[PDB]
């Protein structure tokens, strides 16, 4: 723990008054500020501006964005299995042996998949041993890449590492080791970073306009004309055509040419990056109704049914998908309890539709019809007393 303390008092002498005040604020309120940094971006922008913990969040986040490192590191931590989409226990605190079948099922749940890390978190740099806090058998051993936030900071006679994780991790492999007589899972993982904007949306708008100022020039008149029909009112008709299985039941060649033009226009300029985007979804996209008992997430068994029904499955959207780069709550979808957090790899068809002037849309990305989303994580938060879900999904070929 020598290097963590050394860099802790190296950073601490260049931390100013409000930064250090936010540092003791995280020292006394680590869990609450951590969960707030996890779930703050889904509230209203004015809820953010009036939030008491938002000042601490932005001070700590700026400190994380200014204390960087030039080389990748390996760090060890213990985190709940519920945080990494494993909704069961492998071995308990009194249990010390892990059988082959539970190792196999944990392997097949963690295989070939990505898991998000968001918010503030305190992490030790070295492998915990005899007397260190080992609450779970899941020892995550992560390779943080270059230019990633890294804060050694001393609390009383101990030292920890505050970071603002905003990245997904790909667990390359796991092993079963014996520490203090107990079977622990040591997980070698790789950080996969994503272009996520959360609440800062003006600069995301600038990026989309810079990447898509010439997009309307690249489209054919059929494709550009059908897109212009689409955002100005034809989205309702085209989505009603596609959702009701139009080309199969009662095929409309005009609407078939319309959706072909929309797909071609989305295919003209692929997105040059992997993105994290927020779509405000309703119950009908999940085969449910507003009056259905499962929509009321204020009770926990509805969330359990949501986990049992939708986690590990593929969500099919036969219509074009409208997504918003801003996670901020809006008056249009305040009542909706589903905010789908979608990850999109490189080269996918689509467009940032707000680059075209004259549209009153708010930072919208269009996605091709018939898409398949892989459900990965479902967190929860409290918009007031209304319990809402955070469905972190992705785009899969």
């Amino acid at each position: 723990k020598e290097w963590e303390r050394k860099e802790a008092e190296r950073i601490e002498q260049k931390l100013e008054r409000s930064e250090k005040e936010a540092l003791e604020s995280y020292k006394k309120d680590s869990v609450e500020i951590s969960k707030y940094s996890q779930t703050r971006n889904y509230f209203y922008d004015y809820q953010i501006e009036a939030n008491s913990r938002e000042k601490e969040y932005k001070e700590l986040r700026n400190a994380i964005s200014k204390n960087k490192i030039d080389k990748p590191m390996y760090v060890y931590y213990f985190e709940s299995p519920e945080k990494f989409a494993f909704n069961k226990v492998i071995r308990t605190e009194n249990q010390n042996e892990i059988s082959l079948e539970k190792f196999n099922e944990f392997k097949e749940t963690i295989q070939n998949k990505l898991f998000k890390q968001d918010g503030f978190k305190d992490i030790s740099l070295y492998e915990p041993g005899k007397g260190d806090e080992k609450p779970t058998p899941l020892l995550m051993h992560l390779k943080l890449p270059r230019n990633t936030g890294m804060l050694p900071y001393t609390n009383t006679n101990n030292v920890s590492t505050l970071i603002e994780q905003g990245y997904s991790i790909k667990i390359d492999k796991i092993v079963r080791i014996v520490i203090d007589g107990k079977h622990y899972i040591k997980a070698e993982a790789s950080v996969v970073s994503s272009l996520d904007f959360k609440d800062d949306v003006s600069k995301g708008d600038s990026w989309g306009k810079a990447n898509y100022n010439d997009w309307s020039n690249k489209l054919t008149p059929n494709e550009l004309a059908d897109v212009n029909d689409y955002m100005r009112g034809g989205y309702t008709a085209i989505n009603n055509y596609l959702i009701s299985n139009g080309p199969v039941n009662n095929p409309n060649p005009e609407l078939d040419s319309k959706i072909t033009n929309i797909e071609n226009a989305l295919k003209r300029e692929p997105i040059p990056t992997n993105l994290t985007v927020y779509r405000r979804s309703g119950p009908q996209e999940f085969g449910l109704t507003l009056t259905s008992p499962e929509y009321d997430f204020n009770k926990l068994e509805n969330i359990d049914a949501f986990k049992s029904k939708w986690e590990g499955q593929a969500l099919s959207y036969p219509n074009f998908i409208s997504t918003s780069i801003g996670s901020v709550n809006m008056s249009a979808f305040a009542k909706r309890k589903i905010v789908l957090r979608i990850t999109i790899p490189k080269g996918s068809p689509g467009a940032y539709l707000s680059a075209i002037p004259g549209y009153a849309g708010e930072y919208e990305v269009l996605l091709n019809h018939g898409s398949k989303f892989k459900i990965n994580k479902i967190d929860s938060y409290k918009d007031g007393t209304i319990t809402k879900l955070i469905v972190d999904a992705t785009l899969i070929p």
Partner: protein
């Protein structure tokens, strides 16, 4: 399932069964006894079940300082080390620099002799007490001197000290450890004591030895040069103690204060021996454990074992007998009613037992309630001292027969022995052990066991030596234990012979000759 201490082992697995395999506790069910494994008991009311700085689990897993001997794997014993200091050659010089009248003599060191120096034997041993009572107790720390290479010559002759001023002394010293623990940062303070008067205290500091003293190893390893006291510098003497070396007295040595460190493995790498002290555990082990010394003629062993006080039902601690405590503290193989080492037989009719006055009184109090008439089925309590003196010669008319001189009239066609057979007699029995293997200026005690299936069959014995002695013994139906003592003289003496004459019906068993101490030399 239920846990009390800072240990992983359950309460049921801390009692009447203890098996620790692949760092996992399991109950002993007695099907893996012959596969080299052993069962323990450790306390379920304290993490440190013994006085050592090691809990039961780390001391039973093998997870401790590996320089500690394997005899401390059981949780019963504590890692208690002892520094003893001995001397070999004394040189007397009359200068403060080095020229002068210098005389050099070789002298043998006796570790465990003063504990059994004031012991008296009896012709018949009453009741079931087959031991001897001592008047004082001494550990392996003290070390006595016996001068051997000394022809007829006064010590003042070699120095020519006339009226007022005698010479200076200088010695060759060596350091030994008799204990199952290593110390590194040695701070040995010793005192060169003269029959109640102290000449000098020697501090060997840190540079003369170093930060390494392995358990059971002399500071010069096997055969090298002794460490001279020429590397707090010189020790004087007057013309009052110079003449007291001559007649009866032997100069002794006693270490007083010793401190050190014990190696503790860290979380990742190497053992830390800097931030430590062997001073917070001296009263931790000394006040709770017992003391057992075993004196082999080649080496000495000292052990401390945790026991039970009988007048306290609150303290839930393991209960130990005598023989089980010896087997646990030393490591022994269990033959049919027999406890064996790799070559050393230990039994109530095979070794000499020395007890202090209070412990002998306790045992005589406890020997009444036993219905088996044995000395090893005695419960162990806090605050005893045990001396087990292995005889230098012992026969039992069995597989063990190590006598360099053959007997006479040997009849082994019998079966009414204490173990194996009993020696049938027809007439005399002659033994003639030569001076080539008797150490001069010593005292030897021959003890034996007899049976006699006749009303008034009696025997005579003659110990023909420099001080010969005749004796008349009346054996009984059961096993009677008898002990006789004799001395010897220098190399120019004749062989020592033992003649025993019975009448053809008495039976002899377990005949052992042992050495006790040194006699003063006329000089």
């Amino acid at each position: 399932d239920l846990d009390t201490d800072n240990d992983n082992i359950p309460d049921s697995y801390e009692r009447n069964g203890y098996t620790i395999k692949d760092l996992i506790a399991v109950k002993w069910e007695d099907s893996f006894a012959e596969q080299g494994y052993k069962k323990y008991v450790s306390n379920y009311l304290e993490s440190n079940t013994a006085g050592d700085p090691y809990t039961d689990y780390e001391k039973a897993s093998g997870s401790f300082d590996k320089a500690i001997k394997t005899e401390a794997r059981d949780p019963l014993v504590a890692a208690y080390p002892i520094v003893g200091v001995g001397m070999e050659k004394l040189i007397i010089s009359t200068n403060e620099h080095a020229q002068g009248k210098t005389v050099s003599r070789a002298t043998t060191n006796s570790k465990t002799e003063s504990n059994t120096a004031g012991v008296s034997v009896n012709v018949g041993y009453q009741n079931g007490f087959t031991a001897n009572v001592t008047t004082n107790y001494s550990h392996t720390t003290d070390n006595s001197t016996a001068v051997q290479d000394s022809n007829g010559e006064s010590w003042n002759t070699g120095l020519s000290i006339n009226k007022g001023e005698s010479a200076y002394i200088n010695a060759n010293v060596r350091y030994y450890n008799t204990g199952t623990a290593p110390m590194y940062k040695v701070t040995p303070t010793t005192n060169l004591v003269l029959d109640g008067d102290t000449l000098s205290t020697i501090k060997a500091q840190e540079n003369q030895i170093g930060n390494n003293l392995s358990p059971g190893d002399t500071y010069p390893k096997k055969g090298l040069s002794p460490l001279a006291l020429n590397t707090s510098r010189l020790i004087p003497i007057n013309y009052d103690q110079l003449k007291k070396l001559d007649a009866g007295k032997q100069i002794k040595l006693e270490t007083t204060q010793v401190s050190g460190n014990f190696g503790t493995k860290n979380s990742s790498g190497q053992i830390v021996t800097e931030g430590n002290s062997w001073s917070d555990y001296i009263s931790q082990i000394d006040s709770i454990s017992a003391s057992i010394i075993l004196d082999t003629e080649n080496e000495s062993y000292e052990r401390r074992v945790t026991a039970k006080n009988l007048q306290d039902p609150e303290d839930k601690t393991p209960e130990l007998t005598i023989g089980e405590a010896i087997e646990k503290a030393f490591g022994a193989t269990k033959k049919d009613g027999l406890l064996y080492f790799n070559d050393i037989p230990i039994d109530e009719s095979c070794v000499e037992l020395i007890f202090d006055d209070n412990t002998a009184n306790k045992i005589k109090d406890s020997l009444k309630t036993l219905s088996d008439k044995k000395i090893y089925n005695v419960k162990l309590e806090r605050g005893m001292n045990i001396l087990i003196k292995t005889p230098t010669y012992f026969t039992n008319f069995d597989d063990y027969n190590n006598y360099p001189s053959t007997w006479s009239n040997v009849n082994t066609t019998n079966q009414d022995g204490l173990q194996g057979s009993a020696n049938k007699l027809n007439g005399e029995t002659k033994i003639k052990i030569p001076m080539s293997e008797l150490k001069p200026y010593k005292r030897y005690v021959f003890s034996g066991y007899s049976k006699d299936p006749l009303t008034s069959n009696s025997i005579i014995v003659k110990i023909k030596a420099k001080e010969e002695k005749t004796d008349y013994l009346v054996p009984e139906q059961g096993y009677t234990k008898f002990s006789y003592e004799f001395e010897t003289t220098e190399k120019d003496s004749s062989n020592i012979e033992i003649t025993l004459i019975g009448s053809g019906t008495t039976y002899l068993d377990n005949l052992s000759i042992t050495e006790l101490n040194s006699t003063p030399e006329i000089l």
